[PDB]
RNA sequence: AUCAGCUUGUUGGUGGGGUGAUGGCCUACCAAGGCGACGACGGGUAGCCGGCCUGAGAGGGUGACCGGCCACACUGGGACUGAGAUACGGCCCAGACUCCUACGGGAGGCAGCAGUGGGGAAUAUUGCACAAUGGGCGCAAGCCUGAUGCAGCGACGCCGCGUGAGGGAUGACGGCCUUCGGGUUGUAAACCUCUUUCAGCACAGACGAAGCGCAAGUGACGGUAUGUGCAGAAGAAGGACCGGCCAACUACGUGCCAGCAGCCGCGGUAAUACGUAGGGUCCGAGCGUUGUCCGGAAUUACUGGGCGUAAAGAGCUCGUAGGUGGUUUGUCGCGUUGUUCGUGAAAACUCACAGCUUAACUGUGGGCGUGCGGGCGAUACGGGCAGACUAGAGUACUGCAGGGGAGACUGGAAUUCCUGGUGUAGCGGUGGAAUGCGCAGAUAUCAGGAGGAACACCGGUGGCGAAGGCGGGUCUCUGGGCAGUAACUGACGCUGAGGAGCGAAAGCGUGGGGAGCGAACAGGAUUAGAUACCCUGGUAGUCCACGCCGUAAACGGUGGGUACUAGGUGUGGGUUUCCUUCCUUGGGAUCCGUGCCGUAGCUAACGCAUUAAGUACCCCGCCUGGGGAGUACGGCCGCAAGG
RNA sequence: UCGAAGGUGGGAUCGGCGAUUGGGACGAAGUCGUAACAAGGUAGCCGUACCGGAAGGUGCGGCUGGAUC
């Protein structure tokens, strides 16, 4: 059955990705919109909307593309999965591509990137790498 | 790295014989009453 | 895969059945 | 495996070996020469290679080879033997050492003396 | 776990006892409890730690010196004195050993500092002193201290220094090569100056002692470290290696002999590899060899591996413990996270500074001490508690296809056998034959009868089943799947260690049945021989009823659940829209199976490719070089074979 | 009363030796055959049963990791 929503919404943007789609149409999930709220201010993806679907909602995401065909995002992956989790400190916060990555964080604060983390001095759980 | 759950046997002390099979307790820690019995109920907290 | 692995294990195989059936009599009584 | 396979059994590393069983952790080990024989190397080679069977005071029978030109070695020897492995004779794990107890340093050798145990000439 | 059950003061209670104190610590009585597949109960091994070695780290090995805790004192048991006892140099008893005896009885315990024997490859002196620090006794002087401070032996380890420095020829010999010209040793040697490090011979001579002492004295190390002089280079270098990995070549002798070797491998008349000489390279009071641990080894893969064909998916399902879980509301603050406080001995490590002529070494001051606990804050995520939803899951109503399964009855073709007509000398079989069947009437051709087994045509990469598997006809009983509606329950789901069930063929037990076929067994033929292939016979079996065994190339050599990633074209089952001739694969739309081809992606390659071997999450099984070996030993199951 | 050492008894468990006996590994030179690899001259292999100096043969069911059509 469907054990992880989160890695489900990271590999179907890798997956329509990868193909040159420009629309994904998901489940709504309030930790999905955060999610997709976060990759959005992070030019990530070109936007991100909500629509009321045949039972419940749904979350439609709208990637960006460069001027020849250049995908914005070249890596998705999850780190802290169902199984074995992942916590991390405020003083042993992941870099990814030696910085020039983005790892979401889910902190008492609320869904913050690591940057965001470091410098309001919190840590919680490592959801995901994108790049 | 995984995160286990793990359970453990207390043997404790209830004077008046309230709290049976089931019920929801607290516990204190207090000088040895017995052989192997370190604990006395302070309050039946939830029913069953 | 390559017959000659199956060709092994079945000479090893063939072998062994022929010694117990060469020694049933032997085996019985002293098992017993 | 799954982690929680992982947490269930673990990983168990290989096994490994004992080497030179023999010495039971000792350098060197004394014996005795019960026995002194020559024997042929493997298909390739061709020679008459020295070796004698000994018994060790870890009350263990052994072969050990006898390097360098000659030996005066018979039965009732007090021998020293050591690790190492020749390649050429499957059987022998072990060699005596020149120059120790019983053995004598080869004669007439100017090159490589201390590997066997030849004093030099003033 | 090739050790699944263990416990009877055992688990609890009460009245007493005992203790410094709680307590089955002990006793009398009452209740029947307590531990265990998060490994009880058994077996093996081992003193634990700060630390040490290795490693990028995680990790692995380890517990030598120094420091902390524990346990012991010839082996076993016991108590007395005190505040305090495993009481090493105390007591009692029982054993083994050593010694004295007048034979009645007595005396001993170096795993304290030295030392002996023995074992071993291997580990030291039967030394000085309480001068300093620490301890016991005493008012004090003072007395005791094999603790301690020193000394001797061992290149055993780390550090430092020396065996000489300058100039000296287009560069003496001699050795060794030579292309017979010449080259290397080599500025090296001989030669004229220089300084003496350390040792050698003399002289002086410490700090450690704001010490101790109420007596004028007080240093074991020690006349030592150290300074000032004396003539002189005067007393001081060896060990490995030179095929390639890897710093460094020629001659001579041996020729598969003697021998070398970490891997591949060198030696049989040209060896840079064996041995000896000259030369060279790397180290240098050291150089090699052996043993042990870590690394390289991503080769047990948490960091950081895999399972189509290289080792690796259980034969297939159901299900127990366990692991994991769709959208949403409130609360707790267990996991998570922030801050503050306490602790984390010293030594060790790291940074800085300082001291001994440098170094090794020492001291001082930070950090480290990656954890635990106490108070306070946060509530995104995971989790608990209390609710909500229908998208997962299950049920309800209406239709669909099917060799899915069990029982009973029953149909025809064909083979064999029997009975009876006709009929004559062959039939059968093979590459060719011969065994064999007939002439006592075979084969062949008709008519009648008995019996058993398998179901032509439909019928194929077409249907059904979890797999193994399933088609002659009819009747009775019965399981699953699909589609349409979406009325119902409201996360009830996924996987599943062990366990249970099902499981081709052969095989086993009891009782039937027996046409054809056919292991074994007989002949014939082939052949050098034929325990076979080919031919003629032929028992078990194949068949039925009821039970056993539990294996297959049980294969897609591909576990189950879920979501996503271009398409084209066959086929099986079902719903609907537009042309409607209103029939036809009329066209489209959509759900569920089953094939072929094909992108992107993946793979060592072959190949897979929406029925993945692609991209991701959950759970289980399995793999770690080839043999020995799926074998032995132990155990469980079976009548046996055997699993 | 408790109680070490000792005596008696039947079991449990872990090892050494053992007349005789089975298989395994490796050997410069030996005897018998030709089983597999090309349709290896009867395609090979898997489970099971019987038989044979030995590789091996045959029956039943299965697989293609089988050549030609």
Known sequence: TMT?????????????????????????????????????????????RTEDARVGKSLVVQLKYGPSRERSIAGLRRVSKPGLRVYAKSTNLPRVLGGLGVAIIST???????????????????????? | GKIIRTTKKVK?????????????????????????????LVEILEKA | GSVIKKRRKRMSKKKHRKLLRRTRVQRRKLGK | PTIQQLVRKGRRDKIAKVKT???????????????????????????????????????????????????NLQEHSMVLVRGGRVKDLPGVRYKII???????????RKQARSRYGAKKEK
């Open chain 1, 4 to 48: 992880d929503p989160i890695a489900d919404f990271l590999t179907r943007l890798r997956n329509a990705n990868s193909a040159y789609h420009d629309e994904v149409t998901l489940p709504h999930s309030k930790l999905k919109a955060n999610i997709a709220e976060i990759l959005k201010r992070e030019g990530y993806i070109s936007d991100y």
């Open chain 1, 108 to 131: 008492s604060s609320g869904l913050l990137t690591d940057r965001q983390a470091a410098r309001q001095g919190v840590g919680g759980e490592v959801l995901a790498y994108v790049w």
């Open chain 2, 12 to 40: 404790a002390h209830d004077e008046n014989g309230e709290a049976g099979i089931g019920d929801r307790v607290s516990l204190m820690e207090t000088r040895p009453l017995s052989a192997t019995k370190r604990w006395r």
């Open chain 4, 21 to 71: 069983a023999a010495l039971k952790g000792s350098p060197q080990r004394r014996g005795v020469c019960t026995r002194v024989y020559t024997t042929t190397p493997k298909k390739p080679n061709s020679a008459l290679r020295k070796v004698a069977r000994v018994k060790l005071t870890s009350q263990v029978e052994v072969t050990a080879y006898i390097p360098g030109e000659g030996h």
């Open chain 4, 98 to 108: 020149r120059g120790s107890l019983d053995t004598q340093g080869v004669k007439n």
